[PDB]
Amino acid sequence: ESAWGPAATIAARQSATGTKTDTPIQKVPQSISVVTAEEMALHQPKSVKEALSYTPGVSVGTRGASNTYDHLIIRGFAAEGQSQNNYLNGLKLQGNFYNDAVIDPYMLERAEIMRGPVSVLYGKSSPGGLLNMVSKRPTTEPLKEVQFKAGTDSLFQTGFDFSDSLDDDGVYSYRLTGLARSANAQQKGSEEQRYAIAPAFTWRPDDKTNFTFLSYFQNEPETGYYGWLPKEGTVEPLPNGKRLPTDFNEGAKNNTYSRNEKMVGYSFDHEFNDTFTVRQNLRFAENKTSQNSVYGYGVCSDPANAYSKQCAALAPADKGHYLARKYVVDDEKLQNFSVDTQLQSKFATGDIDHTLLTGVDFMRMRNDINAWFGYDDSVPLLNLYNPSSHHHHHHGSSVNTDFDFNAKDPANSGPYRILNKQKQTGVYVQDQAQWDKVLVTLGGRYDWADQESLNRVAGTTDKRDDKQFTWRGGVNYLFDNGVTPYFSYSESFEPSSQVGKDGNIFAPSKGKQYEVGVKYVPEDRPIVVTGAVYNLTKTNNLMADPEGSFFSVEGGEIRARGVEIEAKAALSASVNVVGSYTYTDAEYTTDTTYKGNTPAQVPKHMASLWADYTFFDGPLSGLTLGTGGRYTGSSYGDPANSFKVGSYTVVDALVRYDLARVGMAGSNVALHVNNLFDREYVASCFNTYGCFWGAERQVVATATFRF
Ligand SMILES: CCCCCCCCCC[N+](C)(C)[O-]
Ligand SMILES: CCCCCCCCCC[N+](C)(C)[O-]
């Protein structure tokens, strides 16, 4: 098993996204989870976001049913500005504004999640939280796969995955992965369309050299729903005592959202001798996204719509059943270049063996944004009473009316045109010293984070250059019986793009995490079990100005302390299990407005458990039956902790059938169901006017043939 390739079992022993060197998980001083492609080929997840439902420390309902972005909250934290923090093949998919990219899970070999500070090896980053996906690479043996999907809300997907060698020595091999997917969103009127293909080529001049060209081209005409719904009609009842159906859509009938992605690069490695191996990962990408969207603001009686004329034109006891709305026309295009070069030195010192990594990381991102935002009375209002009727919870909500996205009344709306630039360069050094049953990891990195933003209207140009250092130190005790206790200290830093009263970009916020835990990776049986408790702190966060202005002030602080336990195993050639528990106690240490409050969208308790069984005997031979549940505790729906979103538990089911008994081994037919009991739940809210219905029960029929 290679950290950059398949793991023959649900549970992987090798990972390289925590130390940037192929290392067995037990030997890693930090919480690292690894979702195998096998696991994904088990729930047929719609996204990488989805594929992380059973992984501890990660919330994945920050948007409920929506899959426009794989935006995750890890250990209670996320990138500033609703930005993702996702890496692909060791290089960050730096997005900006609405320009964040997503890779389809079918093109992945494994999706990994690293909890806690990650700058010691990757540069600027939100504290406690990083996602790194590993593209599929040409396989060791021929692979000719064709897959067919069909499901709820008109889901139709056809995809292939082929990989073979051009020569008999395997010096030249390739892999072409592609898919076409179409479906209707949960919300009436909205569609999802995706076309993507991943061309990959591997060149092995010998057994010490590997150059692998990795590319991904994806076009999404319609990405789907991305609106906001009031807590009134979702979490809480509307005046008429009723609620909005989970399929309710408060967007213009003519809402449109698209994204285009193109990227080419490579993962290279060469072994010079017995102590020096060089590896370099490079990628260049140009992604675009545009949109005509009418999203919903709070209900007319929401503090938000206080200054809304349209709202202040209704009988005082009616402002609470009418929905305020706004809009945004967007069109962006960014280019992203990234290259990481590193030298791995292997040498000894007495009874101490060393694995020294030293490398430089570089990236440049440029994103040109040209959008238009509607304000308080930018768009009509929507009455919630009628769409709240039984007839709609019965026969469904109704598509609304078009909207003039062209009309840009200088009154209710305004232009937003910005040119964002970003550059980061870092040099890091780490060593993995092993003194027999003692493994000590220590390393540090220095980053040169430069940014520059041009406001094509204010004609302003805000720039800031951050020089920052972060290091991490940890130790793991290799108990020959599998258990591997460990503890470590790490740091992260995240630049601000905002500017204070002094017309200057704020200084970066930081991450300081203290963590200890134990990892059980028995060498005999194929089972992994990790457990950890930690104390993560994000210092110098932005908070409301005491003087009360339109600007924010720094110095704020938030602490996140909790416990995460996870288990993945192959308790049999017929039994498989995955489960985890998460305890997250995130709280505002220092803050003008929310001291002592817990950040929205992060539940205090989370747990999941999944198990599947396969038959090899009797008339049920080649039959797999699996099921599991995901628990999401209650959480707060706003910074003020005004109201709360209630907990919920969703059950998943699986029935797979090996198609061997028809002259087709390796091929199979399966039925996947998510939210078996079609439970109705508000996934979360980030504010009183921003709530998202969870996903309704979904059924998918899959037929994946292996030729
Ligand atoms: C596989 C581990 C399952 C553990 C589930 C624990 C549920 C804790 C619920 C917390 N509670 C709502 C009761 O406060
Ligand atoms: C997949 C694990 C299932 C855990 C379910 C835990 C439910 C706890 C309910 C406690 N309650 C909310 C009623 O106080």
Swiss-Prot record:
Motif (TonB C-terminal box): 690-707
Disulphides: 300-311, 685-691
UniProt KW keywords: Cell outer membrane, Disulfide bond, Ion transport, Iron, Iron transport, Membrane, Receptor, Signal, TonB box, Transmembrane, Transmembrane beta strand, Transport
GO CC term, one of those recorded: transmembrane transporter complex
Site, Interaction with phage T5 RBP-pb5: residue positions: 526
Regulation: Binding of ferrichrome or colicin M enhances the interaction between FhuA and TonB. TonB activates FhuA through interaction with the beta-barrel.
Domain TBDR plug: 24-136
Keyword field contains Transmembrane helix: no
Membrane topology: Multi-pass membrane protein
Protein name (database record): Ferrichrome outer membrane transporter/phage receptor
Organism field: Escherichia coli (strain K12)
Lineage: Bacteria, Pseudomonadati, Pseudomonadota, Gammaproteobacteria, Enterobacterales
